[PDB]
Design a protein around this motif. Structure first.
Motif, PDB file in Angstrom:
ATOM      1  N   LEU A 231      56.324  49.286  53.865  1.00 54.34           N
ATOM      2  CA  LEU A 231      55.803  48.388  54.893  1.00 54.34           C
ATOM      3  C   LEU A 231      54.271  48.453  54.963  1.00 54.34           C
ATOM      4  CD1 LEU A 231      57.931  49.976  57.813  1.00 54.34           C
ATOM      5  CD2 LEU A 231      58.901  48.604  55.959  1.00 54.34           C
ATOM      6  N   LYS A 232      53.601  47.537  54.267  1.00 53.09           N
ATOM      7  CA  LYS A 232      52.167  47.300  54.475  1.00 53.09           C
ATOM      8  C   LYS A 232      51.963  45.909  55.072  1.00 53.09           C
ATOM      9  CE  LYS A 232      50.451  51.200  53.795  1.00 53.09           C
ATOM     10  NZ  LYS A 232      50.463  51.228  55.285  1.00 53.09           N
ATOM     11  N   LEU A 233      50.749  45.658  55.567  1.00 57.20           N
ATOM     12  CA  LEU A 233      50.476  44.621  56.578  1.00 57.20           C
ATOM     13  C   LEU A 233      50.908  45.115  57.970  1.00 57.20           C
ATOM     14  CD1 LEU A 233      49.193  42.541  54.720  1.00 57.20           C
ATOM     15  CD2 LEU A 233      51.073  40.973  55.238  1.00 57.20           C
ATOM     16  N   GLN A 234      51.246  46.402  58.067  1.00 59.41           N
ATOM     17  CA  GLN A 234      51.540  47.045  59.346  1.00 59.41           C
ATOM     18  C   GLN A 234      50.257  47.257  60.141  1.00 59.41           C
ATOM     19  OE1 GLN A 234      54.999  50.111  60.296  1.00 59.41           O
ATOM     20  NE2 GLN A 234      54.080  50.605  58.306  1.00 59.41           N
ATOM     21  N   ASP A 235      50.347  47.084  61.456  1.00 63.91           N
ATOM     22  CA  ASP A 235      49.249  47.389  62.362  1.00 63.91           C
ATOM     23  C   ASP A 235      49.476  48.806  62.881  1.00 63.91           C
ATOM     24  OD1 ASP A 235      47.234  47.513  64.272  1.00 63.91           O
ATOM     25  OD2 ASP A 235      47.638  45.521  65.085  1.00 63.91           O
TER      26      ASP A 235
ATOM     27  N   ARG B 271      47.578  50.777  64.636  1.00 66.00           N
ATOM     28  CA  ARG B 271      47.085  51.060  65.987  1.00 66.00           C
ATOM     29  C   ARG B 271      48.243  51.052  66.983  1.00 66.00           C
ATOM     30  NH1 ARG B 271      43.994  46.482  68.146  1.00 66.00           N
ATOM     31  NH2 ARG B 271      45.844  45.407  67.314  1.00 66.00           N
ATOM     32  N   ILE B 272      49.128  50.066  66.827  1.00 62.41           N
ATOM     33  CA  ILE B 272      50.145  49.742  67.835  1.00 62.41           C
ATOM     34  C   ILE B 272      51.576  50.140  67.459  1.00 62.41           C
ATOM     35  CG2 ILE B 272      48.842  47.930  68.980  1.00 62.41           C
ATOM     36  CD1 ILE B 272      50.503  45.896  67.222  1.00 62.41           C
ATOM     37  N   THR B 273      51.849  50.272  66.161  1.00 62.70           N
ATOM     38  CA  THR B 273      53.163  50.713  65.677  1.00 62.70           C
ATOM     39  C   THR B 273      53.526  52.080  66.275  1.00 62.70           C
ATOM     40  OG1 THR B 273      53.194  49.470  63.580  1.00 62.70           O
ATOM     41  CG2 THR B 273      54.421  51.544  63.620  1.00 62.70           C
ATOM     42  N   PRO B 274      54.773  52.233  66.772  1.00 68.41           N
ATOM     43  CA  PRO B 274      55.235  53.516  67.308  1.00 68.41           C
ATOM     44  C   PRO B 274      54.984  54.700  66.369  1.00 68.41           C
ATOM     45  CG  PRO B 274      56.869  51.841  67.754  1.00 68.41           C
ATOM     46  CD  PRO B 274      55.763  51.162  66.993  1.00 68.41           C
TER      47      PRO B 274
ATOM     48  N   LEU C  73      67.680  57.296  63.314  1.00 69.22           N
ATOM     49  CA  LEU C  73      67.534  55.982  63.944  1.00 69.22           C
ATOM     50  C   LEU C  73      66.398  55.985  64.965  1.00 69.22           C
ATOM     51  CD1 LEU C  73      71.273  54.944  64.543  1.00 69.22           C
ATOM     52  CD2 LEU C  73      69.834  54.383  62.583  1.00 69.22           C
ATOM     53  N   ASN C  74      65.425  55.101  64.752  1.00 63.47           N
ATOM     54  CA  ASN C  74      64.221  55.035  65.581  1.00 63.47           C
ATOM     55  C   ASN C  74      64.539  54.632  67.019  1.00 63.47           C
ATOM     56  OD1 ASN C  74      61.422  54.016  63.411  1.00 63.47           O
ATOM     57  ND2 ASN C  74      62.995  55.589  63.100  1.00 63.47           N
ATOM     58  N   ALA C  75      65.415  53.643  67.172  1.00 63.62           N
ATOM     59  CA  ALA C  75      65.816  53.155  68.490  1.00 63.62           C
ATOM     60  C   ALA C  75      66.539  54.238  69.297  1.00 63.62           C
ATOM     61  CB  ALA C  75      66.689  51.915  68.351  1.00 63.62           C
TER      62      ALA C  75
END
Ligand SMILES: [Mg+2]
Ligand SMILES: [Mg+2]
Lengths: 195, 244, 204, 226, 231, 250, 240, 117, 212
Positions: free
Chosen positions: G50-54, G56-59, G76-78
């Motif tokens: 996953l690139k184009l990820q932000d 700053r804000i991504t968990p 599981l992230n959730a």
């Protein structure tokens, strides 16, 4: 609890609160601190019914600390005061309401401005340059209305506060055993240990 | 008794995957493509309506882009009815926060809340999950312009540019190729439309098959404006960017 | 003890030729003690204006409640709420607390954006609507306001003439009430411009 | 408040004054007390004004749904039964005192209902603080087999008795006539015997009379483009 | 087969297999005997140990001064049902100042067991009970099955190899019913009855459990050296 | 007892399909054809009264239903499912709107409420989806005239003109050739009757066709006079005679 | 309410739903914990699919439960958000009633208890999450590191790893970590943690996260460049 | 599938019999009773050398006069221990005495068959 | 009733009288007004006898559960807060309680919390509660020092209750003394006020107003 005073000057908010705890006939304590730090730059003083005061204050403290950890962010003084108002407005139509009046002194790090909010047990909120609860305002507001300037230094604020406490000690029937004074500014919260 | 007819919607497979979540993601891969691109001076949301008709009343139609409040909007990929259930809940959460703190809800807090609701349907209750993936475009004074996505598992992540729905693999590669950090909104508008034009399953990309929105500080001074584009305005920006 | 006169304050609204006006004092108090001179009692949701007198905690709560509800209305309806519709929403919301009511006296003022027709309305604490053609009054000096408005008001006043009439109605009513005053605000509302004027008045 | 109901040859008429009060103060001088439960079932309310309005609109709403469910025009006895069972359950705490009148496929009807949930039948009824003044007129001039014109005259005369003699009542007379096989005709301000005389003086001020501290434009428009 | 997945399903011949499987748990349990005369009622129970280091599982439970039972099958289910009997005996004494009739106690146990055979989610009880008691109509002995069926008898036996003891009691019927005013001889008859169900093992001092209730005898349980006299 | 079916009966299959919704749409496909056309000054909705027996009085079975004075509805699919949805739609128009705002809901929002009810029967425990597609026509002050379709999934779309059920594919093509943005209400009724004739086998007259319009306010159907702002319902069901008059100019 | 027993025993005495929850943990990105003499370091893998990820804000993968305790996870992230929220609420509840912040062991015991509960409650599935919980007890300078898993069992570790390819990094830690002499400084501990992840990660770019927790609520996350300097120094010593 | 409270044809509860198989996979625990005291011992069985073994807690105090050792799925024991501790303390509150060891054991065993749907 | 507790160099002294009255009627002279919560914690009885007895025994059970669960002695702060939070739940229902929760731990040192039925929880050095509280305060305030010996502190507590017992009609019977150390409390006997008064009068020279 008795006297709680607040004054917002140029760069800080100063809260003064009495030290006495009286249970009817006897003064059980003369060093009681009627305040809780809600966040690094937000302080709340309180007065009202015995038990409910500390219970409400610690409940609010726990909630703001929870928010701080969850978001890794300190809520603005305005946001904290709104949360507190809603809790008291909810409480006034409960089975047994919190009989607690508060002053919230905070330094907003975003706007670089001190802010003082006065909220009573009904959930009545106002932002003020200076405030009080109970009979404290009846003795002190005429002095504050005369001397207050928005560009006052912290030292000038403390001096005006001393004049207010002196008038209280003269004309009030109850011995409130002096006050603990705390300052809220850009660097956080500190206690003036000689007053 | 009733156990006989229970599909057991909240169980792990032997590989440790959630059956229903995986199958819901398969459903979403057939929905119209939605794209979000974040720039320094704003955010773009572009989305393709699914094979339409000439008798569809477009100017009153909404299936992709929804307003959550004045600062936050979402693009939808999946079951529209499922999305509207969650959208209404999110709108309420935003207003609850505004009433409590007297400040607009930060973007991530709204996103986390909706994502937790999705998570619950995967762990308890025995109900099917929501067949929806969201792109969240929003602004707050802490992190500024932000893009997020969430899916039926309740997992969410932040993005500079992202796609959901059909042909996300192709779309994401095209975005990864042309996206730059110093990009502006007008450039991002062009990138989004060019990417949809190449990934679409339709013969040509026209105004009647698109929904478009921008979130700009191109609002007079220190504030943010949401612009849900009208059919004629989508037609004009297609001519301006040289697609029609 | 009486919840509707702990904090004090007043609101008045009037209609004119292609315009409406709504005004309020700025005082908040704890019975005899003056607490704030900046407590505004008029709020707006789009082009619809709402004044609220009574218990100040309920004034704040109801403003937050109607901001909540008109924001959801706008998101779902895709248009701003009109004065006639908002009036019904206030009435419904108040009656739902029939046996544990908000201790308030709300006043609605605005112009319908489609018909151009000036509109005002008033309510009791539990939701009964008073839709007068001329004027609506509320608060701890409502008797005084009724007296002022009844003699000063005439129909079809131009915006700048209506300003003088409503201002003088508020000011002189407030000066005969202990729990009202400490400043005043007047809104002059036309179909696509609203002017807000703070008045100079005695501070006792 | 003065409200009356009168039965006649081919229907029923209801009337009311137009004054609403808060204690001794007149809140509204042209209040509308005749409410519509359904097109041809109307009622007039005395007591707590919010309760009379709210209970009317609730039963009116449920009556409309009932009419749609049954494919039949609403009946006065249904409105009566629903009103009384709602009011009885709240043990008089909903302060609604109503005169209910209307026409339906069964015929023409006139009932009264009190806040605790009791109801009554009659050819002529009166409610409110001016009910004794109104009933005095009704007991003096009512007869069997009244015409439409005679009933309207009797009803408005009974309201006038309240207007002139009861301090709780005043201003104008509103009338609604419900005749069998016809549209109900609502006659708002049927009589206007209390117009204020011209004042001795104009109280329009010279412009600039009021002292002003600050002026500012209020932004009622949404956040703008560009 | 296809009809034994739950208690809410009849088979094509009208059988309830979950109930029948619960009945099977009793047959695996250790043998216990019940018998009575006109003055006394006796329970005899062969207790089962896990191994030579372990204790012998208790079989007899007191329900009141005038009533008690012995169990065979799932012991925790006997605890649930005996607790219910204790409560019902107690309700009768507290509310009506009345000792609960043994026959009425049987009716209550039947109805409690029945509800677990007609509803989804639940299961039948996996234990059989022999209830003895002395009330206003003299000595009584009851046999409880988790199908709900309760039966009043002169004598009986349940558990593994219970058929041998049951035949002996059927022969001795005319003799032991006449043992009035002699508790020791009635117990002897019960010890001789349970002996017809033993194989390889014999009655030892920590193996044997005896209970008795009668005209002027509260429900009492004998274990240890108190039963050596009868070995 | 107790409802022990607390789990979903509609679930995703490996291919991402929601089977029960697809099967509900199949039931709609078998249903009798119904259509809707929007004009500049009105909307028309129409369907065939497929009488199950000639001894049955088909006037007692209403396929076109008034939801509010300015909103009407027609369906294709399972009749009983439609009937209960009409009951729920009429009630929700009051409970979630009229009892709050003192006015009837705009078409789009009532459609939204009906759509929500249909969505929940697709996810809630122990229930199947509704086996109907609805066509809802209406007018309100700020949105003007509108026409919406609602499907078993809970999805809804606005139309200029459309058809659902048996012969919908052919009917929609017929409507595409005839519809323009300058049609008057009488032109739309004429086109509706022309379109509906193609999918009807047997008798084609006022007694076998059910047709209603959303048009001008009808003060004659209000039931009372005296309030100037109240001008009557915009929903009107055409009579058997009114349909036959327009079948001569056909 | 939905009451179906999803977690049940099988003939061989296994609870498959709990065991399948562990398979979800196996799929999650790798997490590692190492305690020094006066610190604990938590390292986390970021998959570069996953690139184009932000960013700053991504968990972020490491979460503060209180000012003195942190929690990282694999799976599981959730699901992890629900455990993190519950732990944060309990941390404040403990401060409110006991007037002392939680010990690291207490917080671990609580989270582990929640996980166990979801293995024998009707109508719920187990959490597809294993956690590493690290920090310092109030007024104590002894480092603490615990691990939990879907079954609800928990234990203390000198060093531990969870998630995909954790078998490999545990192999590394078992031969490189000496109990008689743990990493004496922050530098040594971070170096050993970055080294352990480099056995599995791919590029040492934006794929490695490092968080250092010291006594008295001293918690800081290292930046890309700071970690990049460790990555550089490790391979330059390896070229020999 | 089949009920969680189902009997087998032999008259045994499937789920109970299956849980006994899980216990067979657990680490060993031993107890010996004497006239001078009772001894309890356990195998810790750490899965890795990096696991600090003194954090493995398979022997637990219920009260001053009652101890307990476990074997099997040890996470399941936590609520059983919590109940045992509560029952021991509650009986002391109600009766101003120590609870009998058998009575404590019986109270723990009452939890066992409280499962179903 | 007269109860007191004070902090000093050697820990905490707890002293109480022994009298219970119903109106003017002396119901008992042998009441135990110190509740032994556990071997390390003490509580004092004032207000409702049952409310204090019941809920402070209950507190002992909660403290025992805490140390079983956490494998560590409960703090005085935590123990006192369990009681104050409990009585706060009942606020309005009519509980009557005024108590000092006394303990000596490693992290805190000697600690006293005044806990009260309207929810009050106050940490402090000297507390005195009951109908004779004002009399005991006088002797305490004028003679208290931090550096008192255990012997002198025990006497000061004894003498302060005697002062109250003499003047307050509803205080008397006997004096119970306790000394709270870090290793637990130590009981220092029951002292009849009748005998104690004459003994103190002669040895001290006080109470010259009373003929002996
Ligand atoms: Mg004034
Ligand atoms: Mg004054």
């Amino acid at each position: 609890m008795d006297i709680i005073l607040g004054i917002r000057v140029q760069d800080s908010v100063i809260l003064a609160s009495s030290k006495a705890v009286t249970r009817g006939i006897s003064v059980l304590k003369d060093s009681d601190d009627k305040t809780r730090q809600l966040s690094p730059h937000t302080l709340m003083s309180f007065a009202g019914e015995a038990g409910d005061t500390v219970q409400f204050a610690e409940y609010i403290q726990a909630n703001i600390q929870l928010y701080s950890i969850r978001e890794d962010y300190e809520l603005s003084p305005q946001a904290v005061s709104s949360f507190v108002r809603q809790e008291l407005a909810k409480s006034i139509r409960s089975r047994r309401p919190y009989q607690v009046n508060v002053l919230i002194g905070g330094y907003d790090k975003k706007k670089n401005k001190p802010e003082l909010y006065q909220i009573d047990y009904l959930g009545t909120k106002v932002e003020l340059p200076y405030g009080a609860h109970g009979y404290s305002g009846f003795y002190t507001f005429s002095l504050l209305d005369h001397h207050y300037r928005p560009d006052m230094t912290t030292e000038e604020g403390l001096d005006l506060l001393k004049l207010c406490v002196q008038e209280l000690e003269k004309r009030m029937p109850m011995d409130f055993k002096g006050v603990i004074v705390k300052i809220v500014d850009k660097d956080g919260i500190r206690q003036v240990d000689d007053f | 008794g009733s156990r006989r007819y229970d599909s057991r919607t909240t169980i792990f497979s032997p590989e440790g995957r959630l059956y229903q979540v995986e199958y819901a993601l398969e459903s979403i891969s057939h929905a119209g493509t939605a794209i979000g691109i974040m720039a320094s001076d704003g955010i773009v949301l572009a989305a393709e309506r699914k094979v339409t008709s000439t008798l569809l009343e477009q100017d009153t139609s909404t299936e992709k882009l929804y307003k959550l409040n004045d600062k936050i909007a979402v693009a939808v990929a999946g079951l529209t009815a499922d999305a509207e259930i969650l959208i209404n809940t999110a709108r309420i959460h935003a207003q609850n926060y505004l009433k409590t703190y007297n400040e607009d809800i930060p973007v991530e807090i709204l996103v986390r809340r909706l994502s937790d609701i999705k998570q619950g349907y995967t762990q308890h209750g025995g109900l099917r999950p929501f067949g929806v993936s969201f792109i969240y475009a929003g602004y707050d004074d802490r992190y500024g312009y932000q893009l997020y996505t969430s899916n039926p598992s309740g997992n969410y992540t932040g993005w500079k540019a992202i796609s959901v729905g059909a042909n996300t693999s192709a779309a994401q590669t095209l975005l990864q190729m042309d996206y730059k950090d110093d990009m502006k909104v007008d450039d991002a508008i062009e990138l989004a439309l060019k990417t949809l034009s190449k990934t679409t399953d339709s013969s040509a990309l026209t105004y009647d098959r698109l929904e478009f929105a921008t979130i700009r500080k191109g609002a007079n001074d220190g504030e943010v404006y949401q612009k849900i584009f009208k059919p004629q305005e989508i037609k004009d920006i297609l001519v301006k960017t040289g697609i029609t | 003890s009486d919840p509707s006169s702990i904090n004090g304050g007043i609101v008045v609204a009037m209609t004119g030729k292609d315009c409406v006006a709504i005004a309020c004092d700025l005082r908040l108090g704890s019975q005899s003690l003056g607490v704030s001179n900046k407590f505004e009692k008029i709020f707006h949701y789009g082009h619809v204006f709402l004044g609220i007198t009574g218990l100040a905690t309920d004034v704040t709560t109801l403003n937050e409640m109607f901001r909540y509800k008109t924001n959801l209305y706008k998101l779902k309806e895709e248009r701003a709420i009109e004065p006639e519709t908002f009036t019904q929403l206030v009435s419904s919301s108040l009656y739902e607390r029939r046996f544990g009511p908000y201790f308030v006296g709300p006043v609605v003022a605005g112009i319908n954006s489609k018909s151009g027709k000036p509109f005002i309305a008033g309510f009791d604490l539990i939701g009964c609507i008073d839709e007068a053609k001329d004027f609506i009054v509320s608060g701890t000096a409502s008797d005084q306001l009724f007296g002022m408005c009844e003699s000063l008001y005439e129909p079809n006043l131009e915006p700048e003439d209506l300003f003088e009439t409503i201002s003088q109605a508020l000011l002189n009513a407030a000066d005969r009430d202990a729990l009202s005053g400490w400043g005043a605000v007047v809104y002059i509302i036309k179909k696509d411009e609203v002017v807000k004027r703070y008045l100079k008045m005695r501070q006792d | 408040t003065t409200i009356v109901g009168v039965k006649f040859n081919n229907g029923v008429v209801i009337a009311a004054d137009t004054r609403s009060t808060q204690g001794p103060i007149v809140a509204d001088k042209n209040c509308a007390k005749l409410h519509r439960i359904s097109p041809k079932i109307w009622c007039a309310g005395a007591g707590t004004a919010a309760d009379t309005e709210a209970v009317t609109q609730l039963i009116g709403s449920n009556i409309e749904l009932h009419s749609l469910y049954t494919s039949r025009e609403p009946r006065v006895v249904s409105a009566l039964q629903m009103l009384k069972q709602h009011l009885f359950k709240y043990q008089g705490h909903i302060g609604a005192y109503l005169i209910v009148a209307g026409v339906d496929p069964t015929g023409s009807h006139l009932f009264s209902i009190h806040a605790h949930g009791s109801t009554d039948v009659g050819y002529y009824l009166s409610l409110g603080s001016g009910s004794l003044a109104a009933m005095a007129v009704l007991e003096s001039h009512w007869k069997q087999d009244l015409t439409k014109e005679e009933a309207i005259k009797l009803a408005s005369d009974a309201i006038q008795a309240g207007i002139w003699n009861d301090l709780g009542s005043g201003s104008n007379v509103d009338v609604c006539v419900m005749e069998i096989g016809k549209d109900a005709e609502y006659l708002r301000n049927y009589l206007t015997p209390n117009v204020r005389e011209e004042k001795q003086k104009s109280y329009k001020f010279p412009r600039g009379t009021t002292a002003v501290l600050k002026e500012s434009i209020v932004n009622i428009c949404d956040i703008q483009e560009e | 087969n296809n009809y034994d997945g739950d208690t809410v399903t009849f088979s094509p011949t009208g059988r309830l297999f979950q109930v029948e499987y619960a009945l099977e748990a009793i047959k695996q349990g250790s043998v216990t005997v019940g018998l009575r005369s006109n003055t006394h009622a006796v329970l005899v129970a062969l207790k089962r140990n896990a191994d030579e280091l372990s204790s012998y599982q208790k079989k007899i439970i007191k329900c009141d001064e005038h009533m008690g039972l012995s169990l065979a099958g799932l012991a925790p289910d006997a605890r649930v049902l005996s607790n219910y009997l204790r409560q019902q005996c107690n309700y009768s004494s507290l509310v009506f100042n009345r000792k609960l009739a043994v026959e009425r106690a049987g009716h209550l146990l039947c109805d409690k067991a029945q509800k677990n055979t007609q509803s989804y989610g639940g299961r039948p009880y996996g234990v059989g009970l022999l209830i003895i008691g002395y009330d206003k109509s003299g000595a009584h002995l009851l046999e409880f099955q988790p199908s709900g069926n309760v039966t009043e008898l002169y004598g009986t036996a349940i558990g593994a190899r219970s058929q041998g003891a049951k035949t002996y009691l059927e022969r001795t019927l005319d003799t032991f019913i006449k043992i009035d005013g002699n508790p020791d001889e009635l117990i002897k008859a019960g010890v001789e009855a349970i002996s017809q169900s033993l194989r390889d093992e014999s009655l030892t001092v920590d193996n044997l459990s005896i209970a008795i209730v009668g005209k002027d005898t509260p429900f009492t349980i004998y274990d240890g050296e108190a039963v050596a006299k009868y070995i | 007892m107790t409802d022990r079916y607390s789990f979903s009966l509609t679930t995703f299959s490996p291919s991402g399909k929601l089977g029960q919704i697809d099967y509900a749409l199949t039931a709609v496909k078998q249903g009798v054809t119904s259509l809707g056309i929007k004009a500049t000054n009105g909307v028309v909705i129409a369907t065939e009264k497929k009488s199950s027996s000639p001894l049955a009085m088909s006037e007692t079975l209403s396929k076109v239903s008034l939801l509010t004075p300015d909103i009407g509805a027609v369906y294709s699919g399972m009749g009983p499912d439609y009937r209960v949805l009409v009951d729920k739609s009429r009630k929700v128009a009051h409970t979630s709107y009229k009892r709050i705002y003192g006015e009837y809901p705009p078409t789009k929002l009532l459609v939204s409420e009906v759509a929500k009810i249909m969505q929940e029967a697709t996810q809630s425990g122990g229930v199947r989806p509704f086996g109907v597609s609805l066509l809802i026509a209406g007018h309100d002050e700020f949105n003007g005239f509108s026409l919406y379709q609602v499907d078993p999934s809970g999805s809804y779309f606005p139309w200029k003109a459309t058809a659902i059920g048996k012969g919908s594919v052919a009917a929609k093509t017929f409507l595409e050739k005839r519809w323009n943005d300058e049609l008057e209400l009488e032109d739309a009724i004429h086109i509706a009757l022309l379109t509906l004739k193609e999918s009807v086998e047997g008798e084609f007259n006022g007694d076998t066709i059910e047709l209603a319009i959303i048009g001008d306010e009808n003060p004659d159907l209000l039931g009372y006079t005296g309030i100037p702002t109240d001008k009557g319902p915009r929903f009107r069901k055409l009579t058997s005679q009114e349909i036959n008059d327009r079948l001569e100019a056909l | 309410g939905y009451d179906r027993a999803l977690s049940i025993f099988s003939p061989d005495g296994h609870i498959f739903q709990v065991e399948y929850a562990l398979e979800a943990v196996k799929r999650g990105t790798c997490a590692v914990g190492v305690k020094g003499k006066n610190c604990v370091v938590l390292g986390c893998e970021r998959r570069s699919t996953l690139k184009l990820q932000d960013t700053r804000i991504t968990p972020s993968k490491v979460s503060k439960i209180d000012s003195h305790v942190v929690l990282s996870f694999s799976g599981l992230n959730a699901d992890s958000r629900i455990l993190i929220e519950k732990a944060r609420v309990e941390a404040q509840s403990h401060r409110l009633t006991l007037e002392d912040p939680v010990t690291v062991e207490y917080l671990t015991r609580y989270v582990a208890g929640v996980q166990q509960r979801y293995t024998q409650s009707g109508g719920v599935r187990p959490f597809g999450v294993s956690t590493l919980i690290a920090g310092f007890d109030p007024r104590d300078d002894e480092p603490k590191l615990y691990q939990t898993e879907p079954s609800g069992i928990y234990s203390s570790w000198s060093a531990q790893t969870i998630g995909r390819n954790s078998k490999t990094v545990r192999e590394f830690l078992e031969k490189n970590y000496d109990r008689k002499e743990p990493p004496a400084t922050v530098e040594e501990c971070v170096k050993l943690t970055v080294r352990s992840l480099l056995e599995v990660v791919q590029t040492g770019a934006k794929n490695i996260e490092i968080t250092v927790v010291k006594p008295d609520s001293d918690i800081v996350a290292l930046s890309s460049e700071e970690i990049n300097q460790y990555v550089t120094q490790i391979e330059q010593e390896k070229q020999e | 599938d089949r009920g969680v409270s189902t009997f087998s044809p032999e008259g045994r509860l499937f789920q109970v019999e299956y849980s006994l198989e899980a216990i067979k996979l657990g680490s060993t625990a031993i107890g010996i009773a004497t006239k001078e005291g009772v001894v309890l011992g356990v195998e810790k069985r750490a899965t890795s050398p990096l696991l600090e073994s003194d954090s493995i807690e398979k022997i637990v105090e219920i009260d001053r006069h009652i101890g307990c050792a476990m074997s099997g799925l040890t996470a399941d024991a936590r609520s059983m221990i919590e109940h045992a501790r509560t029952a021991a303390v509650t009986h002391n509150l109600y009766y101003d005495e120590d609870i009998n060891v058998e009575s404590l054991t019986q109270s723990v065993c009452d939890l066992a068959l409280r499962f179903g749907e | 009733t007269t109860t007191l507790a004070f902090r000093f160099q050697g820990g905490i002294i707890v002293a109480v009288d022994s009298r219970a009255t119903a109106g003017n009627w002396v119901a008992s002279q042998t009441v135990k007004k110190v509740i032994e919560i556990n071997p390390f914690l003490l509580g004092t009885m004032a207000g409702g006898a049952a409310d204090c007895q019941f809920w402070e025994t209950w507190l002992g059970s909660q403290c025992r559960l805490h140390e079983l669960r956490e494998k560590e002695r409960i703090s005085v702060a935590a123990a006192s807060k369990i009681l104050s939070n409990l009585v706060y739940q009942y606020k309005g229902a009519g509980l009557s309680m005024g108590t000092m929760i006394c303990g000596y731990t490693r992290k805190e040192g000697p600690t006293i919390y005044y806990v009260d039925s309207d929810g009050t929880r106050l940490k402090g050095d000297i507390f005195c509660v009951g109908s004779g509280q004002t009399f005991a305060y006088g002797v305490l305030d004028s003679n208290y020092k931090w550096d008192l010996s255990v012997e002198d502190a025990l006497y000061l507590g004894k003498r302060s209750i005697l002062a109250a017992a003499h003047r307050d009609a509803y205080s008397g019977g006997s004096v119970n003394l306790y000394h709270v150390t870090e290793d637990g409390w130590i009981y220092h006997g029951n002292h009849d006020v009748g005998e104690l008064f004459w003994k103190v009068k002669e040895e001290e020279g006080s109470f010259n107003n009373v003929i002996g």
